[PDB]
Amino acid sequence: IQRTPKIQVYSRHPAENGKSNFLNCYVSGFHPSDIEVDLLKNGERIEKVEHSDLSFSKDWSFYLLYYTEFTPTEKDEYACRVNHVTLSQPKIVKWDRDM
Amino acid sequence: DPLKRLTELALEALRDEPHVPPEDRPLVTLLQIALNLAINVVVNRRHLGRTDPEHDRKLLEELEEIRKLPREEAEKRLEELIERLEEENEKLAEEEVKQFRS
Amino acid sequence: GSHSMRYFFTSVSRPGRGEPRFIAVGYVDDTQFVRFDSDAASQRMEPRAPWIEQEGPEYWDGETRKVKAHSQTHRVDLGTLRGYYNQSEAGSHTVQRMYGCDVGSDWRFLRGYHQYAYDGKDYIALKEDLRSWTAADMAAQTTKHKWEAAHVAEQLRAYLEGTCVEWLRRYLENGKETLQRTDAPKTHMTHHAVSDHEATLRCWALSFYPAEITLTWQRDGEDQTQDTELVETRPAGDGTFQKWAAVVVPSGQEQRYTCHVQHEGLPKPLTLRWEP
Amino acid sequence: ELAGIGILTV
Amino acid sequence: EVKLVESGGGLVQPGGSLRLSCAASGSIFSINTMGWYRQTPGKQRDLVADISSGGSTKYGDSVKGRFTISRDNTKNTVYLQMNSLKPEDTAVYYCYGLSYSNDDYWGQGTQVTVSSG
């Protein structure tokens, strides 16, 4: 059985315009482990993105954290794009600073 | 029961690891890896019905030969035995697949 | 004040594209401290926490040799299980193993774990008494009968009750500054208008450790579950965790709602109400 | 520390 | 809002070349990244190549060195030059685009078949 990933995009610290921060895309509850996560800024890929090592939960479903440095502004739009065998097309989740 | 003796030697190796000088500790870890593979090989040959106590005895004599032997010369002999056990363990699992499907 | 150590193993076959990929991670509580990747160039067990870097070269040599032997074992199991289930030679499949130990608030042995899965489904597991096995199907019963002959339960019991507990205490001592800490959650509430007569109250819990936490919305004392949205607890990336819970509230009636936070670092469960 | 014994093939 | 019109798919021999194109109609100039994904039945769609309005490109590992993407921002058109085609390149090639607000759009796809028969 294959399980589709849950996706949360958020900042490490409360976002303040002009203050350096970290943009996170946390994917969890998916199976199998092969997955692609991209961070997006104003409609294009953010090049340098790192991720945590592969681990899994009690139900054996994997989880990963993708993160990069960023500085939020009032007009810059951020998002995350996730691709998995359970998805017919890559799914995009936008970043809401209040979520 | 050769598998009993290998299990007792593995339990001894796991208990001796704390109470051993730090220089002998790498040899203890290599012994645990070799003893674990010896148990895996013997139990795989048991599962296949290919029980040959002659082959079982040759594994034990080589392991005890590595002990009582100076440390650095023993660490290389265990590494060679481990690689040889990993090869045979792979061959045994391929025959276990043929036995299960048939 | 209870603690735990856990090792997670994953091996994924890639037919035609090389040997299976093996990844292993080690955890103390909610803190990772070691990692291994068969595709990494180092080919070594690597540190992932500051307090584990103080271990000597003998530690890293022994851990590397053991994790490499495990990668070969789980590599063979991918071929075995593919035959046991009569599956194609061209499909990607996964094997996972997990084992570890718990200690109570007295740091004495509490619980032992060792489970195995194939393609994300339970295969074989060691029971709590650490002397017998739970098998999922006929293929797993084959592994069970083989592991019973090899006294695997006896070997794993000696490790889980002895070696695992002893090394967990060693790690808790060396990493006392970070492992034996309990960061309380910094909390706040936010208000967002969804309509001209409705609104969203979101209760935040940030920068807390360990990850276990409880967030509950209640309205006039009634448990407002089945109407509250709860996100899964997520890592902040700095060693702490985050979580929030939200509820849709009619305008003007915000003071009739309360948020409640239970956490190890909080002496008393906090209560948050919307402050204009 | 990893388990040195008890990790066998399936 | 944005419509993507693809063309150029079809049958080609192993070792041959093929040139795909994709133009954006409508609310164009609101599209940053454009590119191609490919997908076989039952599986997900994998990245082939994409390029931003600034020219930043990314290629999938299996197509790096054989495919090349180019772009004309004045008419919002991207081109995919596929060289040294292999039977494994057989898939449906979907054009896609991302607005500057990270809204994604897709075309209907074009079939590409690499076969000797």
Nearest chain E alpha carbon to A87:
E44
Written as one string, the DSSP assignment of E26-54 is ESTTSEEEEEEEEE-TTSPEEEEEEE-TT
CB within 8 Å of C232: residues ≥ 6 apart: A6, A8, A28, A29, C243
For chain A positions 77-96, those within 8 Å of chain C (CB to CB) are none
Q: Three-class SS of residue C119?
A: coil
Contact (CB, 8 A) for A8 and A96 = no
- What DSSP state is assigned to residue C51? G
Contact (CB, 8 A) for E39 and E60 = no
Give the strand pairing for E10-12 and E110-114.
parallel
Q: What residue ranges define each of the domains in chain E, with the CATH number in brackets? A: 2-114 (2.60.40.10)
Q: C235–A31: do the CB atoms touch at under 8 Å?
A: no
Q: How far is CA A98 from CA A49, A95, C203, C204, C244, in A?
A: 23, 9, 11, 10, 10
Measured between alpha carbons, how far is C265 from C261 in angstroms, rounded to an integer? 11
HSE-up of residue A10 (Cα within 13 Å, Cβ side): 23
Nearest CB among D6, D7, D9 relative to B89 is that of: D9
For chain B positions 42-101, those within 8 Å of chain D (CB to CB) are 43-44, 89, 93
Q: Where are the domains of chain C?
A: 3-179, 186-272
Contact (CB, 8 A) for C183 and C208 = yes
For chain C positions 160-179, those within 8 Å of chain A (CB to CB) are none
Residues listed for chain A: 99
Measured between alpha carbons, how far is E76 from E49 in angstroms, rounded to an integer? 16
Q: Which CATH superfamily is domain C186-272 in?
A: Immunoglobulins (2.60.40.10)
For chain E positions 49-108, those within 8 Å of chain A (CB to CB) are 50, 52-54, 56, 58, 94, 98-104, 106
CB within 8 Å of C117: residues ≥ 6 apart: A60, C94, C95, C96, C97, C123
Give the strand pairing for E77-82 and E18-26.
antiparallel
Neighbours of C89 (CB within 10 A): 10
Q: Three-class SS of residue C50?
A: helix
Neighboring chain A residues of E98 at a CB cutoff of 8 Å: 40, 43-44
Neighbours of C129 (CB within 10 A): 9
Chains with ≥3 CB–CB distances under 8 Å to B: C, D
Nearest to B45 by CA among B59, B66, B31: B59
Written as one string, the DSSP assignment of E93-104 is EEEEEEETT--E
Nearest to A73 by CA among A19, A22, A11, A23: A19
Neighboring chain B residues of C89 at a CB cutoff of 8 Å: none
Measured between alpha carbons, how far is A37 from E101 in angstroms, rounded to an integer? 18
What region, left, alpha or beta, does residue C178 occupy, with left being phi > 0 and alpha being psi -120 to 50 degrees? alpha
Buried b (16+ CB within 10 A) or exposed e, A80-93: bbbbbbebeebbbb
Q: Which CATH superfamily is domain C3-179 in?
A: MHC class I-like antigen recognition-like (3.30.500.10)
Nearest to C98 by CA among B30, B85, B40, A54: A54
Nearest CB among E33, E54, E102 relative to A94 is that of: E102
Nearest chain B alpha carbon to D10:
B93
Q: D9–B11: do the CB atoms touch at under 8 Å?
A: no
Q: How far is A38 from chain C (nearest CA, A)?
A: 17
Measured between alpha carbons, how far is C45 from C91 in angstroms, rounded to an integer? 29
| D-A interface (Cβ pairs under 8 Å ≥ 3) | no
Give the strand pairing for C241-250 and C31-37.
unpaired
Measured between alpha carbons, how far is C33 from C50 in angstroms, rounded to an integer? 8
Q: E102–A89: do the CB atoms touch at under 8 Å?
A: no
Nearest to C12 by CA among C3, C21, C4: C21
Nearest chain A alpha carbon to C230:
A99
Nearest chain C alpha carbon to A52:
C237
Tell me if chain B has a CB within 8 Å of the CB of C62.
yes
Q: Where are the domains of chain B?
A: 2-101
Residue type, E31: I
Question: With the C-alpha atoms ordered B19, B20, B21, B26, is the resulting torsion angle positive or negative?
Answer: negative
Q: How far is CA B35 from CA B45, C97, C139, C145, C206, in A?
A: 15, 21, 26, 20, 48
Measured between alpha carbons, how far is C152 from A28 in angstroms, rounded to an integer? 32
Q: How far is A90 from chain E (nearest CA, A)?
A: 8
Q: Three-class SS of residue C178?
A: helix
- What are the beta bridge partners of residue C30? none
Task: Using CB atoms within 10 Å of the CB of residue D5, give its burial: 0 to 12 exposed, 13 to 18 middle, 19+ buried.
Answer: buried
Q: How far is CA E111 from CA A87, C24, E2, E47, E85, in A?
A: 20, 41, 22, 15, 14
Contact (CB, 8 A) for A66 and A25 = yes
User: Cis before residue C20, ω within 30 degrees of 0?
Assistant: no
Place of tokens 């305008």: C251
Q: What is the resolution of this structure in A?
A: 2.3
User: Cis before residue C210, ω within 30 degrees of 0?
Assistant: yes
CB within 8 Å of C223: residues ≥ 6 apart: C216
Three-state secondary structure of chain B: CHHHHHHHHHHHHHHHCCCCCCCCHHHHHHHHHHHHHHHHHHHHHHHCCCCCHHHHHHHHHHHHHHCCCCHHHHHHHHHHHHHHHHHHHHHHHHHHHHHHHC
CB within 8 Å of B6: residues ≥ 6 apart: B35, B38, B39, B42, B60
Measured between alpha carbons, how far is C217 from C256 in angstroms, rounded to an integer? 11
Interface test with B, best of C146, C147, C160 (most B CBs within 10 A): C146
Q: What residue ranges define each of the domains in chain A, with the CATH number in brackets? A: 1-99 (2.60.40.10)
Inter-chain CB pairs, A–C, below 8 Å: 74
Q: B25–C62: do the CB atoms touch at under 8 Å?
A: yes
